[PDB]
Amino acid sequence: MAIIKREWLEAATDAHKKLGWKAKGAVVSAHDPSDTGPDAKGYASRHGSVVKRIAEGLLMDINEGADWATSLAIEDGADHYLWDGDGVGAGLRRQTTEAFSGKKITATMFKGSESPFDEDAPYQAVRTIGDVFRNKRAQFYYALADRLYLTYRAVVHGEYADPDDMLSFDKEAIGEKMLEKLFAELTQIQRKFNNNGKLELMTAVEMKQKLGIPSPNLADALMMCMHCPA
Ligand SMILES: [Mg+2]
Numbered sequence: 001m002a003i004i005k006r007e008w009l010e011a012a013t014d015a016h017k018k019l020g021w022k023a024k025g026a027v028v029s030a031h032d033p034s035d036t037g038p039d040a041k042g043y044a045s046r047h048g049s050v051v052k053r054i055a056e057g058l059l060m061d062i063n064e065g066a067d068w069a070t071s072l073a074i075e076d077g078a079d080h081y082l083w084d085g086d087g088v089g090a091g092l093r094r095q096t097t098e099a100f101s102g103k104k105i106t107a108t109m110f111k112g113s114e115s116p117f118d119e120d121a122p123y124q125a126v127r128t129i130g131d132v133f134r135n136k137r138a139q140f141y142y143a144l145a146d147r148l149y150l151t152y153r154a155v156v157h158g159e160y161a162d163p164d165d166m167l168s169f170d171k172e173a174i175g176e177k178m179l180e181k182l183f184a185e186l187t188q189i190q191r192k193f194n195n196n197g198k199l200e201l202m203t204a205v206e207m208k209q210k211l212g213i214p215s216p217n218l219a220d221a222l223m224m225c226m227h228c229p230a
């Protein structure tokens with residue numbers, strides 16, 4: 001039921017170097033403020049299709065966490081910042097917008113439980129996005145999975161893909177230790193049964209209680225980065 005293969009992640013490591021392309025596009029950053037306020041938090045940032053930072057935020061309350069993540073977004077030259085507002089982070093917009101005052105950084109609250117973005121559009125790669133994905137959490141985790149798989153096929157099978165549809169991990173920028181932590185979380189993200197035939201993922205609470213796996217905040221942070229707001 002896992003949606004991402006470890007082999008894809010290994011292939012995607014330095015894929016831009018292996019295949020000879022450079023990051024192009026906006027810088028997108030996202031923050032997972034943890035489930036519960038004080039536990040481990042996540043941040044991820046990419047420049048176009050190249051992931052450049054994966055960071056954990058430790059021993060912080062919810063407000064310290066948002067200060068940390070928004071400061072990283074500033075350091076990373078983000079054009080767009082997202083954060084998970086479906087839970088304990090639902091009240092962070094004022095602090096977030098204060099942090100970005102005077103800077104050209106958009107702030108978007110991500111709510112994974114919402115219906116998918118652009119849900120009446122045709123599904124690509126009479127069936128619409130909303131017919132395929134239950135919600136944004138599924139939509140954007142599969143956006144990630146699709147990028148990774150296409151990257152794997154390009155790197156390992158020599159099948160051309162547009163870099164804009166791929167995802168590379170800049171290992172030197174991110175650091176080996178944090179990259180490994182991210183990967184160990186990403187391979188735990190799992191599909192669950194859905195009674196309307198839609199793609200749906202296990203929630204963090206389910207992952208915890210059913211399988212004993214801790215909240216995948218780095219994975220979630222990266223997933224949210226897949227949505228570029230505008
Ligand atoms: Mg969350």
Ligand SMILES: [Mg+2]
Binds near residue numbers: 032035204
């Ligand atoms: Mg989370």
